[PDB]
Design a protein around this ligand. Sequence first.
Ligand SMILES: Nc1ncnc2c1ncn2[C@@H]1O[C@H](COP(=O)(O)OP(=O)(O)NP(=O)(O)O)[C@@H](O)[C@H]1O
Ligand SMILES: Nc1ncnc2c1ncn2[C@@H]1O[C@H](COP(=O)(O)OP(=O)(O)NP(=O)(O)O)[C@@H](O)[C@H]1O
Ligand SMILES: Nc1ncnc2c1ncn2[C@@H]1O[C@H](COP(=O)(O)OP(=O)(O)NP(=O)(O)O)[C@@H](O)[C@H]1O
Ligand SMILES: [Mg+2]
Ligand SMILES: [Mg+2]
Ligand SMILES: [Mg+2]
Ligand SMILES: [Mg+2]
Ligand SMILES: [Mg+2]
Ligand SMILES: [Mg+2]
Lengths: 516, 516, 516, 47
Amino acid sequence: QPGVLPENMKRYMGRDAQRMNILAGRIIAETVRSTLGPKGMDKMLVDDLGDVVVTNDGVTILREMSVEHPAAKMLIEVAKTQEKEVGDGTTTAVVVAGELLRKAEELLDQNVHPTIVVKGYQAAAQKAQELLKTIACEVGAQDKEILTKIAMTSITGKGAEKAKEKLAEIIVEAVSAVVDDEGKVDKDLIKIEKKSGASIDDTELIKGVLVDKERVSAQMPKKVTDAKIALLNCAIEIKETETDAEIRITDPAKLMEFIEQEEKMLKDMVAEIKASGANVLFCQKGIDDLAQHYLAKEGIVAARRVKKSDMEKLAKATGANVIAAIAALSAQDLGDAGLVEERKISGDSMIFVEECKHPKAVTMLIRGTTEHVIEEVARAVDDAVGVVGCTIEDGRIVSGGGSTEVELSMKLREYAEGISGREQLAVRAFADALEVIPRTLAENAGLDAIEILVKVRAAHASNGNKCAGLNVFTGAVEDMCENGVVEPLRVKTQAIQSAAESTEMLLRIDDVIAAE
Amino acid sequence: QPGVLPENMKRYMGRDAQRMNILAGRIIAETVRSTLGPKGMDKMLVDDLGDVVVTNDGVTILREMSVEHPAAKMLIEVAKTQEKEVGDGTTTAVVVAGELLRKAEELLDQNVHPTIVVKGYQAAAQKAQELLKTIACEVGAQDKEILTKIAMTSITGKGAEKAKEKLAEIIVEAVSAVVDDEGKVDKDLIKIEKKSGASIDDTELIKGVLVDKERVSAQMPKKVTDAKIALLNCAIEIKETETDAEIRITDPAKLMEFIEQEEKMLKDMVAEIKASGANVLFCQKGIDDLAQHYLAKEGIVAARRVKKSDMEKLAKATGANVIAAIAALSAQDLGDAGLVEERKISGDSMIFVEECKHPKAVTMLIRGTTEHVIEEVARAVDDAVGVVGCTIEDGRIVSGGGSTEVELSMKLREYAEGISGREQLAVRAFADALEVIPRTLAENAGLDAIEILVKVRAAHASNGNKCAGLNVFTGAVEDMCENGVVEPLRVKTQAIQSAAESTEMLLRIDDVIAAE
Amino acid sequence: QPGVLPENMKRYMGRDAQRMNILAGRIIAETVRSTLGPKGMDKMLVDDLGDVVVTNDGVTILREMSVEHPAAKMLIEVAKTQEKEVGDGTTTAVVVAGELLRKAEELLDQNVHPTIVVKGYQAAAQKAQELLKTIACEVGAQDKEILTKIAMTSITGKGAEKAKEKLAEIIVEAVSAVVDDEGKVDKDLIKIEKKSGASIDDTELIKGVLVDKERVSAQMPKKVTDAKIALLNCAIEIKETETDAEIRITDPAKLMEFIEQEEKMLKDMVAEIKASGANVLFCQKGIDDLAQHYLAKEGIVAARRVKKSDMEKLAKATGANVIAAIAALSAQDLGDAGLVEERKISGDSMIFVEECKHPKAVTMLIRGTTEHVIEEVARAVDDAVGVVGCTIEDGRIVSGGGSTEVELSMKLREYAEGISGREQLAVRAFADALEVIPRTLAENAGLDAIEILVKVRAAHASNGNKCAGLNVFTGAVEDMCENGVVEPLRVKTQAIQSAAESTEMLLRIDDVIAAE
Amino acid sequence: QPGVLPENMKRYMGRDAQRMNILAGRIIAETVRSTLGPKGMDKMLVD
Ligand SMILES: Nc1ncnc2c1ncn2[C@@H]1O[C@H](COP(=O)(O)OP(=O)(O)NP(=O)(O)O)[C@@H](O)[C@H]1O
Ligand SMILES: Nc1ncnc2c1ncn2[C@@H]1O[C@H](COP(=O)(O)OP(=O)(O)NP(=O)(O)O)[C@@H](O)[C@H]1O
Ligand SMILES: Nc1ncnc2c1ncn2[C@@H]1O[C@H](COP(=O)(O)OP(=O)(O)NP(=O)(O)O)[C@@H](O)[C@H]1O
Ligand SMILES: [Mg+2]
Ligand SMILES: [Mg+2]
Ligand SMILES: [Mg+2]
Ligand SMILES: [Mg+2]
Ligand SMILES: [Mg+2]
Ligand SMILES: [Mg+2]
């Protein structure tokens, strides 16, 4: 007689399920562990098409490997959410999750039951969030100096040689520029443009936007100072009714009369544009060739078929209103830019709209000698934008270099004393797990992690220094705050909560049923 | 139990990743190395269609072979950016990059950590940019004597037999002609035409453009001197309204009335063109057969369906504006050319527009006995256009023959002296890598590189001659600057920065993960 | 082009090598773990021929599986040596080894160096051997009461339903009978015979041997009491010279003369045999049909073509000399037995030689209702023979139920206190490893291992009872010695030494290179 | 593992490159040589 469950399926039960998930978990974490910290190393990933990524970026590495294993996929989500919510610490969150799994294994191997480790882990994680709040330092949303340390620290995570002050300062300026009325930071308002050049150091902030267009007619000016900018959502073409209409001509002289009426409509449209005071125009749709001439005659710069996202960012940066009826355009809808110029950048003709006074969107123009060099600089800039953004929004930071993890572990071990029975083992395991961060930072730096940890713990003990950690450079336990190695509270709260919730989910599993 | 990482994957870790990337790098550099300098040799590349490229051009070689290795691709980017930013030195940039990887291996082998190597490379490179600025010689953007030396030097890189004075002077004229208002050179403004002929020496500069078109009517003049040129992007055909319109005829008499209105409309367009004073007309689109007759009656030479990019180059060279409505055509929209002539070249009839007064676009008409001979001449012209452009824009040149690399190398060793720790080893390594240029120049010349190096070094020592290099023709060490062997500063700055940045990126890699 | 190491080869390095070895070991151990102790369960193994094995026997399970994994094979050697040296505790030895590897992982995952783990493991192993000597109790080789407990405990390891006093006593009698004149036990001297019957309880000890033979002629007695046994390894056939000899007959009268001669010497061999006083005969070679008759006439029981093996057991059993020259047969070569009988057993005709007075070999005749039921009873008999034999040879025993492991583990932690530095971690890990035994006993008994262990340790703490263990049959912590749960010291010394040596070997591996 | 330059490629270097080019040229020339001048002979080519 036939089998109930499909004969085309692999199944793993009890200890086998647990080992499968735990192992898949640990292995995923191990792949990114060697990237961690300023002394970490990079991966080169090559896809089936032969395209290559080289990067220190945790979540990028994990996405680009084509990981199939179901449990591994559950940990990759930890990295994706870290990137979305914070923009930095993707490796950290994943490595913590893998270590929570490793630490749980030791407990299951001693007959501690899964629901008990889940329970302890949940209590530990909650305690950790409370401890994090007390540990965190308040900072002002407009403390340029601290935000710059936040940016430098982030970039350094991808290597000391990336952390140029000028770059950190540029990033802080970019993010501060787009903070909205509610004090919120929308990362998308910072346009990232990537162009080969003489050097990574040519990277610059443009207060404005880069539009991949040329002016529609060579007769128009190619450089305009103090431009007055019109933004049109409608085509500068002959308008037609929605209701089907046809012209009937029975008198040979009407040909010219109609042709001359359509020409006049275009001349009128151009007239209205001129009247607003606009000397630069971006149209989201088509501009009739004939109108192209009239604009040129008037000395008005125009680009046509501008991307909707371009129009939207122009508006944000220049302060113009995208107008849908040429008739309705007025002086009040115009934006301002100190400079509008068409010029070539690494061989490509583009229109720069720059030197805007209070742009709500700006552009990081990232330069470097090669495409692949630029990509990684762009990834670093992104990490920095994320954490500067977090610090502006939250006004809360912690010390880095694994100082905070050490402080947490110590405190959690104190907490665990007060826990009765078996759950205590789980809480203690969760505490021990956090130390994978300082431990890995040390090993990637070529240091002895055990002795390093002994020293860092000692500096935290007996009401010591919550900011003490190992400076991977000097090799000494130092005050990370004094050294300016700092990171948003959010990096830690998100990473730890994600690691906890995802491992709790995985540790509840006693049966894996895989089809096909 | 299932695999965590995809099983379809090849992986190389630690020493193997480093070896892979270093070796692939080195091998890519070694392929173009024998092309380096005036005594370098050429490659013949045959693709899968049997098409043939023969060239001394580094980036061309590297593009044309179909390299798939991931680390080699990173190094090819170096050649591509060199071509884009400078136009010359593509081989130099790749060879330095290869040598940087080679010197890094020696340090990795005697147990220096990668981040220290990158730290050292970055410091040396930064210092080298600073030194390059003081080594450079100031030069005037209108000093044609120096620009001609720049161009001669460039062409000689591809073989002295290519370096003719007439050719180099022509190139200087071409580039001088298109310098814009900001003092920038867009090398796309110099159109390259390639046409077989009696000799390479028949290559000529046309102050104007070639149009692959014939006049639309044989009744039109084949030749106009002191041409007045109309540029129309609108068809010279009966204009249709945008709104759908049909003629209705009820009276037989009206049949002719409309037909003859359409002819009058045509005559009018032609009269207006004539009225501007135009005797030559390029139209981007169609011209009614009847209009073609009228034009020919009026003595006006016309070509139809002209490529938009042709229209554009025409406007740049003659001064005309491209007009959208024949109604607006005035005398001020007209371009000038000393000669417009339809004639045969290499069996093809084309329209020459020559002897323009202040052309903003011009045309190098490259001749030679065969197609493949011409191709390489055009490549050499491109190198020279590139470096003449840089010189005009930058006003900074250095001496060639590897003299500048020797000077740099010597100064970096001094700098290295004051560096503390392992980092010093990397700085010295970078210094030494630069000498791959003078060493390879001497190799390809059949000279003893080691002895040559001793000599050139001695000539730079004791505050000697920063311009001393080995002249591959003399066999002697001489002042290269006095010999007129010079190249733009930008050649060296772009090549060293790109080599530095790409190799630093490659050296960070400890893990290669290649799918499929 | 081309590769140094073979292209057809898998390789695992550093952490991957350690992981695959550690995992393979752990999984091998987990396979037999559930069999451990009196509450352990059994495996049914089926081979590729569809033959089945049902057993609780650790080493049998590991041999019958077709393990190919290289590290796993290393651990199976542990079970084989345990079987060879001791005959019991094969599961115990593998489970300790598996746990040593698990414990080692956690050390490796803190970055303790393999050699330090190895050094710690060796130090703990040597200390354990010293502690075992003092922990052990002395017993006399003639203490049947203790030997019976050793036997009962052993059989109980395979389930309480197997552990019958009568059977244990038989086994003690069997081993006692074969102890040699130096106090050594050769388990080979206890012939195992397996025959289906009415009940497992019908198992019996035969003071003598079973011969799978029938007497050569039905005319011979079927039964003889107080038999005088001759043992010949020469054929009772006509003797032929070693030099090629041929009879030549020329006189018809001589035909019968040579025939009559042959039978007369046959008749004389038989008279030589009778003369010795033998009435029972076992011949290794053939017995001429005619001599068969003669033996029959003289009333002598004989069997022919007896295999060397039985001849040798017969000699040991009855004290006869296997003789090679019929002429040399004297009455002092004859063995004795109370009863020689040809008898059917389970439908099989066999010669029982029993009730010998001081047999140097004896026969365990194992009975049971089915072949597979019998096979496992024989395996349990083999365990018991093994440990009774060890106890007789060593005169040292320890208490069972995991009591000795707990005592050992407690003393080793004390020892670890005085170890400086990192090695201390390893010594502690080794100590903790030994508790896998009491832990697994409890697990399989369905008890809570964590609390059980807390209790047993407390019973061992500060001058406690070294014999304190959990009794799986009562659920309480009791004095295992006073309950009679005891096992030879050698079980523990071999198990721990094997586990330590094999895992130290595996832990030194950092590179797996596998062909094909 | 793996190769930098494509695995599907022939390559001829130094004297081998010069030889194959020189030979190919010479053979091409020898093909039409016998046609040269008023006493030259003709080819029949079939596609
Ligand atoms: N100067 C320093 N000394 C010690 N630790 C540092 C220093 N600078 C940064 N770090 C730490 O390095 C860690 C970040 O490294 P990084 O490789 O970027 O991990 P990540 O942010 O978790 N992953 P990713 O999303 O790829 O950037 C943080 O723990 C930092 O605190
Ligand atoms: N007369 C000379 N004597 C010695 N060296 C020279 C002389 N003329 C040019 N050179 C050098 O030869 C090098 C250029 O040769 P070349 O083969 O073109 O290399 P490249 O410019 O780096 N590659 P490519 O992009 O293909 O042109 C430069 O280093 C020049 O300084
Ligand atoms: N009454 C008992 N209470 C607690 N433990 C017991 C008792 N009787 C026996 N044991 C233990 O059970 C263990 C032996 O069980 P067993 O399953 O035979 O393992 P093994 O000897 O290592 N493997 P094998 O070679 O297959 O017999 C020993 O530790 C005994 O001390
Ligand atoms: Mg980071
Ligand atoms: Mg990132
Ligand atoms: Mg060159
Ligand atoms: Mg070139
Ligand atoms: Mg046993
Ligand atoms: Mg056994």
